[PDB]
Amino acid sequence: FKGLDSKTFLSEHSMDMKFTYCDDRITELIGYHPEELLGRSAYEFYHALDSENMTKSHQNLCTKGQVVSGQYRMLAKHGGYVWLETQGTVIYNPPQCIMCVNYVLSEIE
């Protein structure tokens, strides 16, 4: 059993969802090192069956400014998928980037 903080990790993205920053917490959870994620679109990691829903979720975030993803699966470094939910928020200026708070809902399956 893990405490709430240990199953949450923050990420930052450009508007096309490429990773620009990721908290090191992701490594214990999903296996990736933050530095290997930079420049990869998050969409590379979404299960096929969640892809159409995440595309709609992204459009909602871009239109509204904030979104909650609902449950989806993210591919782990050493195969397997975890269930996650993400709250996304667009940071706008005087859109600049997307801030994601990601919470793991499962073990690697």
């Binding site: 709430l4 949450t8 923050l10 930052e12 920053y21 908290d23 400014g65 904030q66 709250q87 928020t89 940071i91 706008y92 200026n93 005087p94 600049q96 980037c97 801030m99 708070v101 919470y103």
Partner: protein, 110 residues
């Protein structure tokens, strides 16, 4: 040209509880020089009350973004304009106290 920014997490009092190492390039401090101090300790005296009042209100805003601009003392003791965009997060499976997530950008006052 990529704006220079770093992320931090704060308790609702303003104390840094998580600092992204991008802070060294943005303001010149190591994360450990910020962790455990109040962001208000690095704020120009004319802006301190604004920044206090912003932390106080972001928790009333149902998780929406609140922005504030203020002068941040860099490691070189110089005043840099920062635009901090903040919002609260609370994991909905819990009743743990919300905390505040900030993105801190060096910006022009022009």
């Amino acid at each position: 040209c990529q704006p220079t920014r770093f992320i931090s997490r704060h308790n609702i009092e303003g104390i840094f509880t998580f600092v992204d190492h991008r802070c060294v390039a943005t303001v010149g401090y190591q994360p450990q020089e910020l962790l455990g101090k109040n962001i208000v300790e690095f704020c120009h005296p004319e802006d301190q009350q604004l920044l206090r009042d912003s932390f106080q209100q972001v928790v009333k805003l149902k998780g929406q973004v609140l922005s504030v601009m203020f002068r941040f003392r860099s490691k070189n003791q110089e005043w840099l304009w920062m635009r901090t965009s903040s919002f609260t997060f609370q994991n909905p499976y819990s009743d743990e106290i919300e905390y505040i997530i900030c993105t801190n950008t060096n910006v022009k006052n022009s």
